[PDB]
Amino acid sequence: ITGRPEWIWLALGTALMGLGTLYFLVKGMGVSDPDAKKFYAITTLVPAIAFTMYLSMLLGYGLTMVPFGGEQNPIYWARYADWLFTTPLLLLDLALLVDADQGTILALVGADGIMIGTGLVGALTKVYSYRFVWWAISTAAMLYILYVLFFGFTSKAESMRPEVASTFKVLRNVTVVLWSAYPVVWLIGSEGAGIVPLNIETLLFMVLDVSAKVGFGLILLRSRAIFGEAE
Amino acid sequence: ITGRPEWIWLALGTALMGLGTLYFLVKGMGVSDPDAKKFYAITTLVPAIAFTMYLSMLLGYGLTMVPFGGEQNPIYWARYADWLFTTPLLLLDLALLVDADQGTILALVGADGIMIGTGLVGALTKVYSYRFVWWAISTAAMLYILYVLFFGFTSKAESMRPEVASTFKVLRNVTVVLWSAYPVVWLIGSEGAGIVPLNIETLLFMVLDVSAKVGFGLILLRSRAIFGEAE
Amino acid sequence: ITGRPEWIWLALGTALMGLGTLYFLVKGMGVSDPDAKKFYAITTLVPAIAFTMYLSMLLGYGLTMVPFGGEQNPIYWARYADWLFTTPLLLLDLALLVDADQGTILALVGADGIMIGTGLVGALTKVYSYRFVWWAISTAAMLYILYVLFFGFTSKAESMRPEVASTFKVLRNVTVVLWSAYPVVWLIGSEGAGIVPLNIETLLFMVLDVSAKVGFGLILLRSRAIFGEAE
Numbered sequence: 152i153t154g155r156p157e158w159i160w161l162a163l164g165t166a167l168m169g170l171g172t173l174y175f176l177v178k179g180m181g182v183s184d185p186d187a188k189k190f191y192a193i194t195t196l197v198p199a200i201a202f203t204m205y206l207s208m209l210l211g212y213g214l215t216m217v218p219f220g221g222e223q224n225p226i227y228w229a230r231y232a233d234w235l236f237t238t239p240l241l242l243l244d245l246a247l248l249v250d251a252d253q254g255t256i257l258a259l260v261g262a263d264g265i266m267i268g269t270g271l272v273g274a275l276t277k278v279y280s281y282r283f284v285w286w287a288i289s290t291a292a293m294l295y296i297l298y299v300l301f302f303g304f305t306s307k308a309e310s311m312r313p314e315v316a317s318t319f320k321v322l323r324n325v326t327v328v329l330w331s332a333y334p335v336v337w338l339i340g341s342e343g344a345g346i347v348p349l350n351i352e353t354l355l356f357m358v359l360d361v362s363a364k365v366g367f368g369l370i371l372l373r374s375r376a377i378f379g380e381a382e
Numbered sequence: 383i384t385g386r387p388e389w390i391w392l393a394l395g396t397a398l399m400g401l402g403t404l405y406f407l408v409k410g411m412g413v414s415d416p417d418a419k420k421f422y423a424i425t426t427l428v429p430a431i432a433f434t435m436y437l438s439m440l441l442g443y444g445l446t447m448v449p450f451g452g453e454q455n456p457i458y459w460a461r462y463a464d465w466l467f468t469t470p471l472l473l474l475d476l477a478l479l480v481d482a483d484q485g486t487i488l489a490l491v492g493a494d495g496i497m498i499g500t501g502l503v504g505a506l507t508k509v510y511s512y513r514f515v516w517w518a519i520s521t522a523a524m525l526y527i528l529y530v531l532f533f534g535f536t537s538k539a540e541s542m543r544p545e546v547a548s549t550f551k552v553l554r555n556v557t558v559v560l561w562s563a564y565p566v567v568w569l570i571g572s573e574g575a576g577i578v579p580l581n582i583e584t585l586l587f588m589v590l591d592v593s594a595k596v597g598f599g600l601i602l603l604r605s606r607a608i609f610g611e612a613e
Numbered sequence: 614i615t616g617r618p619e620w621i622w623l624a625l626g627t628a629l630m631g632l633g634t635l636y637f638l639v640k641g642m643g644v645s646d647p648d649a650k651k652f653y654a655i656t657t658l659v660p661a662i663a664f665t666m667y668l669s670m671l672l673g674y675g676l677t678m679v680p681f682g683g684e685q686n687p688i689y690w691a692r693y694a695d696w697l698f699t700t701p702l703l704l705l706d707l708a709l710l711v712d713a714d715q716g717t718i719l720a721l722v723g724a725d726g727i728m729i730g731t732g733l734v735g736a737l738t739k740v741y742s743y744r745f746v747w748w749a750i751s752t753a754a755m756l757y758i759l760y761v762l763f764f765g766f767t768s769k770a771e772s773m774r775p776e777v778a779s780t781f782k783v784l785r786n787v788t789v790v791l792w793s794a795y796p797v798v799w800l801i802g803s804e805g806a807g808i809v810p811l812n813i814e815t816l817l818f819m820v821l822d823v824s825a826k827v828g829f830g831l832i833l834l835r836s837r838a839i840f841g842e843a844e
């Protein structure tokens with residue numbers, strides 16, 4: 152395992168998702184309110200899933216070699232198995248918060264599926280120049296999702312309770328900044344232009360992942376907005 | 383890319399899904415009605431997904447070689463990744479139209495999953511005779527879906543509004559004819575008996591796909607049945 | 614096909630799922646009640662899916678070789694493709710019975726996904742000792758699901774009708790005993806410690822699968838609890 156210089160960030164990533172998982176699980180034990188049970192379920196599953204994928208990467212199962220640029224390139228495919236399942240869960244947390252209509256939910260999830268799916272094709276593509284075509288398409292899907300999180304949700308939030316409006320605003324600004332970092336890291340790291348080496352690329356995705364998952368989860372689950380208005 | 387004679391139909395297929403996607407996306411911009419937002423979301427995702435899969439085929443990512451009949455046979459596995467996601471979306475458009483009960487929706491989606499899943503196993507199977515066993519099972523699943531679209535939906539449609547009844551009738555006759563063509567093409571093309579060569583097989587699936595996706599979408603989204611009855 | 618000594622149990626498994634499928638399908642023909650249509654759809658899909666996976670195993674498609682312990686080990690990966698789809702359907706049958714809240718449903722399905730997903734990673738893992746780490750994690754997910762089926766459902770059941778309470782009790786005791794057998798068989802069979810040979814391991818999973826699927830289905834679908842209270 153220690154054979155790879157990026158092992159330390161995978162181990163740390165694995166540790167933080169595990170602790171994040173346990174904390175949310177224990178904290179959600181004293182919850183009976185049907186609405187809150189939804190947010191806790193969605194938000195505990197996120198780092199539990201990430202935990203398993205970080206572990207598969209640490210143990211070397213979630214890693215394949217991809218030939219391009221005349222080199223065998225280490226590609227951690229498990230990142231995309233992670234994101235495939237956890238990014239729609241995160242979107243669902245946001246969408247439920249503002250009581251999004253079903254059409255908008257299906258559009259967000261579908262676009263998110265396209266974003267992660269094309270990114271994975273981009274990561275596994277053997278023809279160097281074509282990798283960035285898939286990058287561009289995935290990034291376009293991402294921009295659609297961010298548009299809707301701004302110009303279809305923000306103006307839905309303030310028609311709702313103030314505590315769901317203020318919490319959503321914060322989670323929306325946290326999401327847009329963090330999510331936008333992901334295609335930049337990809338483009339400059341070993342999957343893309345290869346300016347930043349794999350061990351720093353792994354560190355960067357690890358910081359973003361823990362922030363996006365456990366950090367987001369902590370902001371959300373300490374808000375009273377997850378509870379129905381009850382006396 | 384031009385190495386394969388079927389490249390022209392993949393390129394054309396890619397182009398038409400892209401334009402179909404853009405047209406539906408722009409057209410759905412001026413939509414606020416919660417019901418219509420569902421149909422637009424479902425119906426824009428269909429060619430967006432197909433667009434990505436046609437592109438993966440064009441660039442050669444969605445293609446593998448399968449040994450049978452003592453030959454290496456080009457199999458476009460991405461067709462099934464496409465259909466896996468877009469055929470239930472199409473079914474969902476129909477089911478929502480007639481306000482299908484949940485049990486019937488789950489049965490349609492499940493059978494559709496079986497139909498595409500067994501077809502993919504059929505396409506990748508190394509023992510020639512066994513390929514047609516999977517064909518038969520997939521075709522049986524298909525026949526179940528068509529039965530329900532006739533003797534569980536048509537008699538649901540006319541208890542509803544006339545504009546949802548007339549639109550559903552048309553989309554049901556369009557679906558049954560187009561869908562039934564798919565197992566015939568498979569059986570006679572390179573995946574099956576191999577009487578029709580791959581480049582014509584690709585053309586035929588391309589015509590059916592654009593018709594089934596963009597054509598169906600156009601009939602649906604110009605109907606007033608997607609809107610709730612509003613003053 | 615007869616090349617493998619376990620072929621007889623795959624053939625028998627295939628046969629029983631097929632007959633189970635046909636029986637449920639015919640029996641659900643005379644059903645109009647919207648609630649009952651849900652249970653019949655969920656419960657017919659279960660052995661139909663298993664039927665296809667048992668057949669893929671019988672024909673040899675659902676089998677790969679995995680190197681560990683310095684040996685090429687036959688691993689039937691199709692078991693997990695089966696379980697991936699059928700175990701949440703079974704959970705859904707239970708959850709609908711007691712009218713589980715949505716949060717609890719998402720938590721059960723998510724944990725079940727983790728349980729099957731980590732089990733599959735465990736089955737395909739090349740480093741012998743690591744296989745049991747994935748076993749432990751999958752088994753922990755399983756224990757979470759059983760906890761909820763006891764201390765979040767049983768006390769939901771008796772607030773409901775007596776016929777849904779008594780049926781759920783039986784299906785809950787049947788599920789907990791049968792499901793718990795699965796990680797034991799894995800640990801002692803060829804995927805784990807390898808004390809029991811593959812042909813007996815296949816027999817054991819076959820008995821459990823038919824019991825868990827067709828047996829469970831028969832108990833459920835002969836109960837009046839699947840029907841709404843109607844005059």
Ligand SMILES: CC(C)CCC[C@@H](C)CCC[C@@H](C)CCC[C@@H](C)CCOC[C@@H](CO)OCC[C@H](C)CCC[C@H](C)CCC[C@H](C)CCCC(C)C
Pocket residue numbers: 235260261264265268269271272275431434445446459462463464466467502
């Ligand atoms: C509503 C939303 C969900 C919409 C979803 C958006 C989605 C359509 C966007 C594209 C998704 C699509 C790219 C998924 C492709 C998965 C693929 C990378 C799996 C690996 O297979 C690729 C090659 C090796 O490079 O296999 C070598 C050749 C092998 C013979 C491969 C044959 C098996 C095929 C992979 C079967 C395809 C099954 C489905 C793609 C399963 C989906 C998995 C997940 C990654 C989406």
Ligand SMILES: CC(C)CCC[C@@H](C)CCC[C@@H](C)CCC[C@@H](C)CCOC[C@@H](CO)OCC[C@H](C)CCC[C@H](C)CCC[C@H](C)CCCC(C)C
Pocket residue numbers: 466491492495496499500502503506662665676677690693694695697698733
């Ligand atoms: C409710 C509805 C959804 C019901 C669904 C109906 C469904 C059950 C019907 C059958 C689906 C099943 C055939 C899916 C099989 C996918 C398989 C083709 C992927 C490619 O793997 C096959 C071989 C190469 O030929 O892999 C070589 C060996 C490798 C070691 C493969 C090991 C990985 C396994 C593929 C893991 C299986 C995961 C799931 C099948 C993911 C589903 C993908 C999608 C295609 C259904």
Ligand SMILES: CC(C)CCC[C@@H](C)CCC[C@@H](C)CCC[C@@H](C)CCOC[C@@H](CO)OCC[C@H](C)CCC[C@H](C)CCC[C@H](C)CCCC(C)C
Pocket residue numbers: 200203214215228231232233235236271697722723726727730731733734737
């Ligand atoms: C809400 C719930 C659903 C939560 C779900 C819980 C889930 C996160 C738990 C873990 C699931 C995860 C392990 C699934 C991994 C599937 C994997 C075994 C497929 C086979 O690929 C593994 C290796 C060969 O050993 O491929 C050789 C290398 C190849 C290049 C592989 C590259 C393709 C990748 C497999 C793409 C991943 C796509 C998704 C994992 C599709 C999910 C399939 C299904 C098995 C979950």
Ligand SMILES: *C/C=C(C)/C=C/C=C(C)/C=C/C1=C(C)CCCC1(C)C
Pocket residue numbers: 234237238241266267270271285286287289290291293330331333334337360363364
């Ligand atoms: C918990 C994980 C999160 C929140 C990950 C988010 C990841 C993205 C938004 C990734 C986007 C990508 C593109 C937009 C194109 C390049 C490839 C990706 C997948 C990195």
Ligand SMILES: *C/C=C(C)/C=C/C=C(C)/C=C/C1=C(C)CCCC1(C)C
Pocket residue numbers: 465468469472497498501502516517518520521522524561562564565568591594595
């Ligand atoms: C947009 C794509 C559509 C509508 C595709 C529909 C495809 C089918 C109905 C395919 C059916 C098949 C069989 C019934 C058996 C042979 C294999 C298939 C997958 C071609």
Ligand SMILES: *C/C=C(C)/C=C/C=C(C)/C=C/C1=C(C)CCCC1(C)C
Pocket residue numbers: 696699700703728729732733747748749751752753755792793795796799822825826
């Ligand atoms: C119809 C099939 C059923 C009900 C299968 C249930 C299977 C399980 C509960 C399997 C559990 C496993 C573990 C808990 C760890 C070892 C690997 C598994 C997947 C066998």
Ligand SMILES: CCCCCCCCCCCCCCC
Pocket residue numbers: 332335336346347348351355
């Ligand atoms: C959104 C963050 C993208 C930029 C991240 C900056 C990382 C810089 C690390 C130094 C680069 C290492 C180059 C020499 C190895």
Ligand SMILES: CCCCCCCCCCCCCCC
Pocket residue numbers: 563566567577578579582586
């Ligand atoms: C539903 C359509 C199935 C039949 C399609 C007919 C295609 C005929 C093309 C001519 C066959 C080419 C044979 C010589 C190459």
Ligand SMILES: CCCCCCCCCCCCCCC
Pocket residue numbers: 794797798808809810813817
């Ligand atoms: C839950 C059941 C686990 C135990 C199953 C017992 C099977 C015993 C079969 C005899 C073992 C064969 C050893 C010599 C081949």
Ligand SMILES: CCCCCCCCCCCCCC
Pocket residue numbers: 235236239240243253256257260264
């Ligand atoms: C390809 C995986 C997509 C499913 C991810 C799991 C989360 C699903 C969220 C569903 C939202 C509900 C839509 C009505």
Ligand SMILES: CCCCCCCCCCCCCC
Pocket residue numbers: 466467470471474484487488491495
């Ligand atoms: C195997 C992929 C199946 C999911 C396809 C995506 C469409 C899902 C439609 C869900 C219909 C809602 C059922 C209640």
Ligand SMILES: CCCCCCCCCCCCCC
Pocket residue numbers: 697698701702705715718719722726
């Ligand atoms: C990874 C596959 C998960 C989906 C399995 C199909 C069954 C889904 C059950 C959905 C329950 C409804 C939740 C609200």
Ligand SMILES: CCCCCCCCCCCCC
Pocket residue numbers: 290294297298301327331334335
């Ligand atoms: C276009 C919608 C406005 C809100 C989204 C901001 C987009 C920021 C660009 C992200 C960087 C991607 C490389």
Ligand SMILES: CCCCCCCCCCCCC
Pocket residue numbers: 521525528529532558562565566
């Ligand atoms: C059996 C249901 C009647 C409506 C479906 C028509 C079936 C047409 C056969 C399709 C051809 C498949 C090869």
Ligand SMILES: CCCCCCCCCCCCC
Pocket residue numbers: 752756759760763789793796797
């Ligand atoms: C901890 C919840 C109590 C109900 C579940 C019983 C667990 C039985 C152990 C199963 C054996 C797994 C190896």
Ligand SMILES: CCCCCCCCCCC
Pocket residue numbers: 279280283284287
């Ligand atoms: C080898 C690098 C070639 C440049 C490819 C750029 C593709 C960018 C697509 C943006 C639409």
